Amino acid sequence: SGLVPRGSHMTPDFLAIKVGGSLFSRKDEPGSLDDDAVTRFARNFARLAETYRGRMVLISGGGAAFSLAGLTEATFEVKKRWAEKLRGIGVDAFPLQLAAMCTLRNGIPQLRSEVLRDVLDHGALPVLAGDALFDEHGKLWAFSSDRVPEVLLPMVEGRLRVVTLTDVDGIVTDDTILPEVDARSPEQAYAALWGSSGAMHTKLDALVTCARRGAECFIMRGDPGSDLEFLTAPFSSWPAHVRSTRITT
Amino acid sequence: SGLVPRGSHMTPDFLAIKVGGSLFSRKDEPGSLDDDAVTRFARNFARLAETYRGRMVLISGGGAAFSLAGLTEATFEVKKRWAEKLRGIGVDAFPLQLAAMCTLRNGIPQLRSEVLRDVLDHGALPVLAGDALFDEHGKLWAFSSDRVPEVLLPMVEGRLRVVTLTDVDGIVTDDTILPEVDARSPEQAYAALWGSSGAMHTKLDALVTCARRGAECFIMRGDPGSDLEFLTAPFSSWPAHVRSTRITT
Numbered sequence: 135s136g137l138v139p140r141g142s143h144m145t146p147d148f149l150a151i152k153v154g155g156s157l158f159s160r161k162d163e164p165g166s167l168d169d170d171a172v173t174r175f176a177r178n179f180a181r182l183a184e185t186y187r188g189r190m191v192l193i194s195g196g197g198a199a200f201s202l203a204g205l206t207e208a209t210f211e212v213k214k215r216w217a218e219k220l221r222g223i224g225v226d227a228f229p230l231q232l233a234a235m236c237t238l239r240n241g242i243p244q245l246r247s248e249v250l251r252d253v254l255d256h257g258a259l260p261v262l263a264g265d266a267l268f269d270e271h272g273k274l275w276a277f278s279s280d281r282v283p284e285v286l287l288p289m290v291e292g293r294l295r296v297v298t299l300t301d302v303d304g305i306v307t308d309d310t311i312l313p314e315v316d317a318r319s320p321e322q323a324y325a326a327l328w329g330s331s332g333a334m335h336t337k338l339d340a341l342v343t344c345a346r347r348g349a350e351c352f353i354m355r356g357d358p359g360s361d362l363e364f365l366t367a368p369f370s371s372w373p374a375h376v377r378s379t380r381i382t383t
Numbered sequence: 384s385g386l387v388p389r390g391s392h393m394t395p396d397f398l399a400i401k402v403g404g405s406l407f408s409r410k411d412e413p414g415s416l417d418d419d420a421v422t423r424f425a426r427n428f429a430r431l432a433e434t435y436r437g438r439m440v441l442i443s444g445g446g447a448a449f450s451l452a453g454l455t456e457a458t459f460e461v462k463k464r465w466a467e468k469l470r471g472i473g474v475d476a477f478p479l480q481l482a483a484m485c486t487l488r489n490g491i492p493q494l495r496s497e498v499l500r501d502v503l504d505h506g507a508l509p510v511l512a513g514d515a516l517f518d519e520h521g522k523l524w525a526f527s528s529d530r531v532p533e534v535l536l537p538m539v540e541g542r543l544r545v546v547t548l549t550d551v552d553g554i555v556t557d558d559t560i561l562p563e564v565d566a567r568s569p570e571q572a573y574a575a576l577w578g579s580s581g582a583m584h585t586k587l588d589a590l591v592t593c594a595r596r597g598a599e600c601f602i603m604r605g606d607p608g609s610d611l612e613f614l615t616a617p618f619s620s621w622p623a624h625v626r627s628t629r630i631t632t
């Protein structure tokens with residue numbers, strides 16, 4: 135509860151990188167991943183993981199009453215595919231079932247397993263994804279990958295950077311990207327989604343939630359072969375070609 | 384830490400049923416499950432789960448430095464196969480990754496996630512298996528399915544019955560099955576394995592560990608189509624045809 139120095143000149147202490155399903159699969163082609171995209175992304179994620187050893191999670195999107203239980207199995211497969219690929223290039227990537235670690239209480243995700251923190255402290259790379267989570271009444275709910283960074287908020291010390299890679303450069307207004315969103319008052323960003331129609335709304339809600347708890351959050355375009363080293367760097371030092379929507383408080 | 388009434392006349396409060404890989408797969412045929420065996424076993428397990436609603440786990444055997452991480456993925460698949468089958472017949476079966484819930488400390492498994500207890504309290508059937516677990520130094524270890532019942536010991540109240548279904552009727556001495564093993568002094572059972580050669584040794588170690596902490600443990604032959612209703616009943620009420628090795632204190 136100490137004073138945390140923050141700003142565009144500061145280096146993040148922790149990276150939560152989420153890779154959208156759009157970027158490595160097609161809905162028209164169920165349970166089929168684009169292996170080339172996974173391969174190329176994995177190379178870039180591997181470099182980040184070495185710098186942020188024990189200070190990063192990779193969150194995968196994608197993945198095919200109690201019937202929702204199949205979701206846990208579907209998203210486990212996606213985590214396996216990333217982790218296998220990453221281990222193949224020397225990263226200590228370990229998939230973790232969020233449903234075994236987290237439950238919902240009054241709608242808020244609750245981390246209920248100490249294992250995630252231990253895995254990080256051991257210097258491994260947790261590979262996470264969305265899931266089917268139980269609430270306090272025993273009902274299952276689909277918990278989007280986009281919301282996984284929320285589960286990190288009480289656990290991460292220091293400066294959390296959350297980056298959601300998607301198939302657009304940010305929040306589009308009209309015609310142009312919105313470069314900055316103030317999480318204390320983001321009504322303009324929500325108004326832009328209404329202009330352009332719920333995937334991005336879930337992203338915004340999640341990243342506003344994280345930004346209100348100090349995180350530096352980005353919506354930006356992913357590309358399998360793109361160098362991501364700049365995500366280790368202070369925002370003010372980013373290359374000029376990089377486009378994003380930045381959500382902060 | 385109260386007085387728990389125990390004995391062959393008493394009904395178990397909780398069932399941990401482990402199904403050996405031998406019973407629904409072949410090592411000569413990697414990652415291939417016998418679907419007919421899984422189907423038939425699932426029918427029998429479903430009946431037990433209805434009686435022991437919230438009071439049972441199913442533990443699957445089988446399943447194909449940091450390379451051990453692939454084990455978590457291999458045993459997740461096996462848990463998925465059981466859970467899918469069980470949900471298909473109306474059981475609320477939910478696979479849980481033990482590696483996300485449990486770590487090793489001084490060689491002892493430690494339950495580190497509250498989720499298992501919640502899932503049980505919600506009346507669902509956890510489907511478990513062996514796994515790759517981290518220790519306190521960040522090293523992965525293969526943790527046998529046969530040892531999963533140990534993780535339940537601090538969590539289960541009342542009378543725990545552990546049943547390990549395998550491809551033999553019990554511990555064979557010489558020629559005959561050993562019907563009773565006293566966990567306080569089981570040197571004779573260990574001597575029998577030396578006669579007949581480490582799968583059964585792991586079983587014995589695990590079940591002795593559980594029996595020393597009050598559990599009523601059995602090694603017995605599994606058969607996909609065999610009725611298992613007797614496993615809800617006091618030992619003294621079991622049908623006369625049933626053969627097993629019973630491990631108690």
Ligand SMILES: Nc1ncnc2c1ncn2[C@@H]1O[C@H](COP(=O)(O)OP(=O)(O)O)[C@@H](O)[C@H]1O
Pocket residue numbers: 153154155156157195299300301302304305306307326327328330331332333334335
């Ligand atoms: N104002 C907006 N700006 C950008 N994208 C938007 C907007 N409103 C809705 N979207 C949609 O959100 C999509 C990104 O979310 P989604 O399909 O869930 O991606 P992912 O697979 O990367 O999670 C974009 O492709 C876009 O169609």
Ligand SMILES: Nc1ncnc2c1ncn2[C@@H]1O[C@H](COP(=O)(O)OP(=O)(O)O)[C@@H](O)[C@H]1O
Pocket residue numbers: 402403404405406444548549550551553554555556575576577579580581582583584
């Ligand atoms: N004294 C013994 N009695 C019975 N089985 C024994 C004994 N010693 C070794 N075993 C072996 O243990 C095997 C059961 O263990 P295992 O192959 O690991 O089965 P599962 O797949 O059911 O875990 C038997 O098939 C048997 O070969």
Ligand SMILES: C[C@@H]1O[C@@H]1P(=O)(O)OP(=O)(O)O
Pocket residue numbers: 153154155156194195196197209263264265266276277278279280333
């Ligand atoms: C809970 C479920 O996994 C889905 P998602 O909403 O996480 O995935 P997206 O990046 O659009 O595939």
Ligand SMILES: C[C@@H]1O[C@@H]1P(=O)(O)OP(=O)(O)O
Pocket residue numbers: 402403404405443444445446458512513514515525526527528529582
């Ligand atoms: C940890 C790993 O799963 C293996 P097992 O030793 O649990 O399985 P068995 O019943 O002989 O297949």
Ligand SMILES: [Mg+2]
Pocket residue numbers: 195280333334
């Ligand atoms: Mg989405």
Ligand SMILES: [Mg+2]
Pocket residue numbers: 444529582583
């Ligand atoms: Mg075995």
